[PDB]
Write an enzyme that holds these catalytic residues in place. Sequence first.
Site, PDB file in Angstrom:
ATOM      1  N   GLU A 171      -0.263   7.506   9.427  1.00  0.00           N
ATOM      2  CA  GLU A 171       0.886   7.279   8.573  1.00  0.00           C
ATOM      3  C   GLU A 171       2.071   6.888   9.436  1.00  0.00           C
ATOM      4  N   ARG A 172       2.803   5.873   8.992  1.00  0.00           N
ATOM      5  CA  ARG A 172       4.067   5.558   9.631  1.00  0.00           C
ATOM      6  C   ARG A 172       4.946   6.797   9.628  1.00  0.00           C
ATOM      7  N   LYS A 220       0.822  -1.204   0.000  1.00  0.00           N
ATOM      8  CA  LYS A 220       0.000   0.000   0.000  1.00  0.00           C
ATOM      9  C   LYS A 220       0.858   1.257   0.000  1.00  0.00           C
TER      10      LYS A 220
END
Lengths: 166, 506, 85, 472, 118, 51
Positions: D183-184, D157
Amino acid sequence: PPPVRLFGVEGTYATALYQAAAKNSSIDAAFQSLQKVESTVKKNPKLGHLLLNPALSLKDRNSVIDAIVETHKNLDGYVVNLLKVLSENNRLGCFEKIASDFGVLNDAHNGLLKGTVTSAEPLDPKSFKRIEKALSASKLVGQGKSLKLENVVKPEIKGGLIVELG
Amino acid sequence: KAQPTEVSSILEERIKGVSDEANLNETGRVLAVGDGIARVFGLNNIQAEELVEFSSGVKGMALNLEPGQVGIVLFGSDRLVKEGELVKRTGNIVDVPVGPGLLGRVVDALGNPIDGKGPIDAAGRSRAQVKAPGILPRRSVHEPVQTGLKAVDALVPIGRGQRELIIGDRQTGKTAVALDTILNQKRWNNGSDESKKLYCVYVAVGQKRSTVAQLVQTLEQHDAMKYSIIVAATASEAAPLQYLAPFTAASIGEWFRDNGKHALIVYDDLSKQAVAYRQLSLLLRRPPGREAYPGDVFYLHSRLLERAAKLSEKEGSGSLTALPVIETQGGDVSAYIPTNVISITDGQIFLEAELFYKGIRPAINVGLSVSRVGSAAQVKALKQVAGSLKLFLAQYREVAAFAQFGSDLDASTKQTLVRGERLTQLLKQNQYSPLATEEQVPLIYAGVNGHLDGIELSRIGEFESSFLSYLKSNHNELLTEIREKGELSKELLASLKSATESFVAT
Amino acid sequence: TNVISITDGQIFLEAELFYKGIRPAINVGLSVSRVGSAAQVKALKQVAGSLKLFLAQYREVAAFAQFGSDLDASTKQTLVRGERL
Amino acid sequence: TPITGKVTAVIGAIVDVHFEQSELPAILNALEIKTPQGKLVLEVAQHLGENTVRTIAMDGTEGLVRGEKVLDTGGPISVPVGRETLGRIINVIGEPIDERGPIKSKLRKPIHADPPSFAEQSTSAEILETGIKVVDLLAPYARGGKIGLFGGAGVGKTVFIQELINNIAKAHGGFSVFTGVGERTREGNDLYREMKETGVINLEGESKVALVFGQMNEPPGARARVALTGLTIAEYFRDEEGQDVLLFIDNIFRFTQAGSEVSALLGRIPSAVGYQPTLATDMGLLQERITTTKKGSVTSVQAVYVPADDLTDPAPATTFAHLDATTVLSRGISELGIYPAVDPLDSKSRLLDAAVVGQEHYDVASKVQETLQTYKSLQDIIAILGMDELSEQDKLTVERARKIQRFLSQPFAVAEVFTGIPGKLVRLKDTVASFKAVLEGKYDNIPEHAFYMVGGIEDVVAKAEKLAAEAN
Amino acid sequence: FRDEEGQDVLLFIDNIFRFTQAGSEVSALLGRIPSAVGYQPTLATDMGLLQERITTTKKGSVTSVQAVYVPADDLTDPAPATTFAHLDATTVLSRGISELGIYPAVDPLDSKSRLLDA
Amino acid sequence: WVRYEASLRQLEQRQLAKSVISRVQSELGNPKFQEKVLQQSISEIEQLLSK
């Protein structure tokens, strides 16, 4: 706004009674009927304590409230309406009577035991808490001097653990 | 000990001062307590998530500032505690005694030392839940590091801030994978190089205290306790302690990395931390969420992992690389906590059950394991020269993927199978034997160049040792350069080829 | 389940059929209709009475051809008939 | 007069302010509580009565003393809007996370706002060419649409979104934007870096990208409302600017996860899969809001991280409907080694029809899907017995399908970190022709390993020749 | 009818599976917590009462005939197994490979009859 | 020898704690709590008069 919210728990009824009666004067007038009602309930060991039971029927609850109010005009004021409302809303309000007393004290009396390292059971009925506190403490020490025993100061436990654990 | 008497006098003097300035008249009285959670009235002005000091001695956090009854969990045993005991507001958010001095010391939940070494100095006591650096104060993984054990590490690196994750069954020794990873903080940290320094800080979230002793002994004997602060939370310890422990490790990581030196962390078995959060939620009053576990499991897990990052030179280019360790049942990759965390952590190293008894002391599923940064932040030895070796690692893993029951279509597949299988029997870096950035590429390079592949597969278990020793005492210049020059050049590749010929010969 | 217990039936358009190129994707074997051809123009019925049985037979030979091997005349004829239909 | 409220209780991230006055704060409005570390704005979420409204935190919940004076903005969180947004990566409150100071916005529309009008919805069939093979043939990307890439946890993704960003943005022809939820942190840093480097946002020049980042670190309420803030910025950039705007949402499943975490503490009885009691309704209100009306064009990339890698999860199931061109990527395909990981037998685009990308393209996709479905269908007997035990027609189809699946991956420009090859963008018409040929056996004798990670069939033949040189 | 007319009074139930769905819907509709099946607490009591209503007396017998719809091979459901092992004889009428060229649409193989003795 | 020294050091604190138990028992047994009550009163008076 009430003096301070009593954090509910069937204290909502008492808080509302205090607010409504505070719309009127209904301060000593409210607390007086409540004190008379509580004294009457204490004056009947049964039928006034066993009357504070969930099993009482709705007709029975309304009738018991009415009979308690029947002690002449000892149920004078909005306390009559509050008692009738609770008669179907929530049966037990002796704690609500004590909460009404707490609200009355908050309106006028205030004060509670300090503690710290003392287990005394005194009171300081004054709005200010920067003058009378020392006089109350010294008096309760030099007068009566009852069972204010916390056994010992917790600092003994503190030092014992502190030394015993490096 | 006269010093114990002096300490007693100083502490009791502090206590006398505290009593003289009690300033506690309307402070709360604990209404009820249980399961390490204490329902306490009063405390009318307690700031949220601030430690509360309780009369029975054991303190605890205050989580749910509910209407009136402010809920404070007990960070200690209940046999001492009782209803109605006074609750003293510490007045401060839970903060951990943090600083470089904690080195080699095992500290309890908030940082109470537990080994018995006395006080450890502090360079700051910050709250257990700090806000992680955002975008601008963050940066890429521009500085690589070594995982120590080859451990499929040149394959999938672990770089500056690489939030890698693991998994395994009970007694899978993934803890040992962590321990070996830590031991690599002796070939760089034990020197004097801050740029090489990765001051690891393991954790101990809910482990049998005997296992804690085993960890301490293994740290001392191999001389690791010089570089590893192992915050401890016993299984016998109370649930709030275990729950807060990962936050304490986060605090220590902030105290180190925020100073500007590249540091590392490795949270212990975090599944126990999740079970502790489950106890804290489902026991106090909070309704349970998905998988019967508390709803904010992801929130807690992120607030742990998301603390780790690799800030930019604006913040000192330091980093707190983290290796959170999660546990499953039956090696279950597909679980709420496991899958949710694998979304949070940037790297995964899956440890199976079969291979854990089938073929490798490491038993790291090379194909299953992955890290979201293979190129950027990899051992420059393992990529700048052996990048083809990394692609060959991926290719040979895919090759061994198909090696179950297919026939022998040709000789190419069979040769790839035999060479890669010798490589896999080779690559397992033995336990507590971290020695890497010297001949990492050598295995794949010799396999494709046909140096080790010609040896018997079983014999490699000693052939590798002999080849390494030959590189050490015979190819000492080339091997030391591969250690230090930072790359295995084509000329160094030729000299290593000569050394490989020598190893093949003798 | 509740709808399939209350509804008239189903055209259980399994994803494999639509993936198998048959668009529209009425998985005939998994289809059902309590009303049926009695609620149909008989002009359809004269051919559907054979169409249904032919699809049924094709269901009987789907596994046999899945093996990908030879068989008797009836089986191969059924497979060709079903695929063509 | 000023509106002040007292924080009556703070439980988890769902705090309570008992605004003890007449005009209580409106629902879905912003309540500001002045913590010393900032402006912990709150979303007045449920008027629980008795002059008590429960709020969702837009920041940290620690240290909020029961009874802090909470001041009410009154209306929704006024996200700054305008061209000035470009090049600044705003925060969930609209506060400029970029250390470039306040951004001079001519206006600020409400974050919560009415969805597109039912009669203002410019139906379109334009296919946006991204170049990736699965995106090329199996499921076209609708130009000015909402393409959802519902896929597993990081199994492609993030990389697919990044590559698509680096592809479309240069020729975006408008003013794109990036909105993240959960979000990372490292991934967010990398996205900012790539946008800066690609010239998409020029630090001291013109920027075609304005970012709103909602990384997973934040409190749950911030995670939920950050994407709404992004959508408000996007709709403002779509109507007011009236030019094509590409807004990409990363891990929109994280928004639903924020809903799930908040709801339980918010007093809603547990729902399916413990998900928030209002999954679909809220997801629609934050998804149906994003559309390309006649006012302007909206390119929407809404990646959904299907929890438990099984798209049967109720949150992903509700997600699947509202998105137009679905490019599913699942761990099954990834485990085969194909980097692009698209499940070709599953990933479909309703933007793809006979008259959309070409009758030949439609037939090519139909044949390819039929072949791959045949391979999957025969996989059981293949494993149980072997490739020899079945038909030579079946064997031929299986071999062609294996080659096709190995042709599904491709080298993506930013994925060169993993595969190592400089990225390859396969031309849509070229890709369709290549696939038609490969099914038709114009290269059926090329090597299988020379079909993975290459460009079109031309690069496939070049790789086959290279393998003829090396492998021999 | 059995009590008064005292003749062997038949008894047919339309869809005891639908009856069980209704019982579960009642339990969930009631405040009660449905857990004596894993999704149904009242299934035991109600199903047993309905089944034991079909009883044989010395005066006469009231033979029942309940139709246990198969939720498409719901071998897992505890209530379906309770119903199937709540009777004595049955007939299996499948639509697949049993209605194929059969107007009775039954399967003489999978059928059973406990009363069947020489 | 060093380990013996470390164990004896711990024995020292343990014995100190054990004698501290008797020391505490002395505090209650002797009515120095009478001599402590005035001190408590004075300390509390000073504390309340502090602010």
